[PDB]
Amino acid sequence: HMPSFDFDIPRRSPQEIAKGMVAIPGGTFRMGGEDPDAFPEDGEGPVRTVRLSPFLIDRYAVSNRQFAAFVKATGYVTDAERYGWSFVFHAHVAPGTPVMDAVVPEAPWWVAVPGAYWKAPEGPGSSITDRPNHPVVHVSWNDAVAYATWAGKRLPTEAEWEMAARGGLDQARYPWGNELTPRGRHRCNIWQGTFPVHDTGEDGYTGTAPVNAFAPNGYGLYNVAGNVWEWCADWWSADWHATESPATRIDPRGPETGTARVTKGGSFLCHESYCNRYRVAARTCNTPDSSAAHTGFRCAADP
Amino acid sequence: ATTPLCGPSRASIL
Numbered sequence: 001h002m003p004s005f006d007f008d009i010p011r012r013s014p015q016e017i018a019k020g021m022v023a024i025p026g027g028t029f030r031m032g033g034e035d036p037d038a039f040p041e042d043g044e045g046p047v048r049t050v051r052l053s054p055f056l057i058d059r060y061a062v063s064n065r066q067f068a069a070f071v072k073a074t075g076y077v078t079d080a081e082r083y084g085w086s087f088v089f090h091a092h093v094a095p096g097t098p099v100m101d102a103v104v105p106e107a108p109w110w111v112a113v114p115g116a117y118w119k120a121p122e123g124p125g126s127s128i129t130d131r132p133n134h135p136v137v138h139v140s141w142n143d144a145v146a147y148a149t150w151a152g153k154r155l156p157t158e159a160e161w162e163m164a165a166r167g168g169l170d171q172a173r174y175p176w177g178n179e180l181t182p183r184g185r186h187r188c189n190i191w192q193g194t195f196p197v198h199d200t201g202e203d204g205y206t207g208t209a210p211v212n213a214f215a216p217n218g219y220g221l222y223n224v225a226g227n228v229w230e231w232c233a234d235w236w237s238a239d240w241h242a243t244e245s246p247a248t249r250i251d252p253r254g255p256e257t258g259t260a261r262v263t264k265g266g267s268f269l270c271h272e273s274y275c276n277r278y279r280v281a282a283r284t285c286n287t288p289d290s291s292a293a294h295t296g297f298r299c300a301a302d303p
Numbered sequence: 304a305t306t307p308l309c310g311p312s313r314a315s316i317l
């Protein structure tokens with residue numbers, strides 16, 4: 001990918017770039033999943049051994065405070081601002097807010113809201129005054145790449161994301177193990193209740209949570225499962241990675257062309273009765289200029 | 304009925 005920017009890339013030292021990041025040593029891991037209930041269209045399989053070069057990855061998804069500093073320093077205008085609207089979950093749109101009649105096929109819980117963007121995540125009249133340490137949302141893949149490049153970083157590949165999110169466990173279902181709520185404790189921010197009608201908020205949150213909520217995984221990463229979907233560098237496909245080759249098994253970057261970019265980790269809206277996509281092997285995609293109230297990103301870096 | 308959707312795209316509403 002060859003992005004275009006209207007801001008210069010500032011000079012930063014290795015120590016500055018590495019703050020808030022954990023060093024993932026080079027090595028192998030078992031990527032993918034073989035859950036029998038996985039949607040074939042998602043291409044969670046096959047399980048395969050992948051070798052990665054050492055990399056750094058953010059402990060936290062990028063926060064509102066951090067994104068605001070980027071915008072302040074560069075004047076960056078996000079895709080949602082250019083388009084003039086972004087996707088908001090229906091229950092979070094205040095009554096009377098102007099809304100488009102737009103319909104996401106099969107997902108009527110999404111509302112296209114004029115004026116919804118990272119600083120007004122539910123549309124005009126909303127703000128982030130009480131969410132400085134929440135993940136930034138309404139950021140597209142383009143916006144994420146712009147932030148990351150300004151920060152001296154990049155997006156993780158899907159393999160890098162998954163190795164870091166798995167946190168040193170071999171083929172566990174979640175970042176922390178195989179049980180969703182071990183010892184009865186919530187470990188991530190997803191939906192509880194009856195989707196899309198009523199979120200009980202049992203885990204403490206019916207929207208985004210702070211980026212440092214819940215315990216980290218074994219590598220010190222927070223909210224890799226749940227909270228917000230996280231953009232990765234790769235173009236999406238369901239089957240490129242089924243080939244056995246160096247390109248798909250050593251520092252894999254995904255297919256060279258595509259239409260949507262990979263997103264990982266699930267969000268505060270995910271639920272077993274509908275998508276069951278907060279398992280660490282799960283995966284989906286979105287087109288790169290799209291944005292939504294449940295999607296953000298974390299950065300990676302080459303040491 | 305069809306694959307659950309978690310990623311709503313701008314293209315999808317046209």
Ligand SMILES: *[C@@H](O)c1ccccc1N
Pocket residue numbers: 273274275304305306307
């Ligand atoms: C349709 O196939 C459908 C609809 C809602 C939730 C799950 C599934 N598989």
Ligand SMILES: [Ca+2]
Pocket residue numbers: 189190191192201202203204205206207268
């Ligand atoms: Ca929740």
Ligand SMILES: [Ca+2]
Pocket residue numbers: 223224225226227228229230264265266267
């Ligand atoms: Ca996540």
Ligand SMILES: [Cl-]
Pocket residue numbers: 130131132133134210
């Ligand atoms: Cl906060």
Ligand SMILES: [Cu+]
Pocket residue numbers: 266267269270271275276277278308309
């Ligand atoms: Cu989901």
